[PDB]
C-alpha cells in the first residue's frame, strides 16, 4: 500500500532520471555542434587579421 | 578591403549562427530545469510516505 | 524494507538538487554568454557597415 | 587611409571577443561534464534502488 505507491513512484523516478540525462547528452552535442562552428569563425578571424597585416 | 569587407561579413553571419545556437541551449536548460523540479518533488512525496512507514 | 529505501531515496533526493542547482549555473553562463555575443555582433555590425562605405 | 585605421581597430577587438566566446563555451563544456558524471551516479542509485525492490 505505502509500499506499492512507494515501488511506482521509484520506478517513476527512474524514469525521470533517464530523462534528464538524455537531455543533457542532448544538449553537449549541441554544445559540440556549437563548438565546431567557433572554431570557424576564430580560423577566419586569424586569416582576417593577417591580411590587414599584409 | 573588398577583401576584407568580405571576411567581416562572413565572420558577422557566423556570428549570427552561433548566437542563435547558444539561445536554443539556454531555452533547453531552462525546460529542463523545470522538470528537475518536478523530479525533486516527486522525490520528497516519496520520502514523506517513507518516513510513515 | 522501508529504512532502507527511505536512505536511498533521501541521498537521490540530495543529489536531484545538486543537479538542479548546476543546471542553473549553466544556464547563468550561457545568458552572459549571450549578452557578450550581442555585443559582438553589434561590433561586426558597425564594422561591416562602414567598410561598405 | 582614416577609414583604414578604425577598420584594423575594431578587427582587432573582434578577434579578442571571438577568442573569449570561445573560452566561455569550453568553460560550459567542462560544466557539462560535471554535471553529466552527477547525473551518472544518480542513475547508478536509482538502478540500485529499483533492482531491490523488484523483488
Known amino acids: 500500500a505505502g509500499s506499492r505507491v512507494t515501488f511506482e513512484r521509484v520506478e517513476q523516478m527512474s524514469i525521470q532520471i533517464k530523462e534528464v540525462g538524455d537531455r543533457v547528452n542532448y544538449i553537449k552535442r549541441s554544445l ?11 580560423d577566419l578571424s586569424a586569416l582576417t587579421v593577417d591580411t590587414l597585416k599584409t
Do not use: A, F, V
Open 32 to 42: 559540440q555542434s556549437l563548438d565546431s562552428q567557433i572554431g570557424h569563425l576564430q
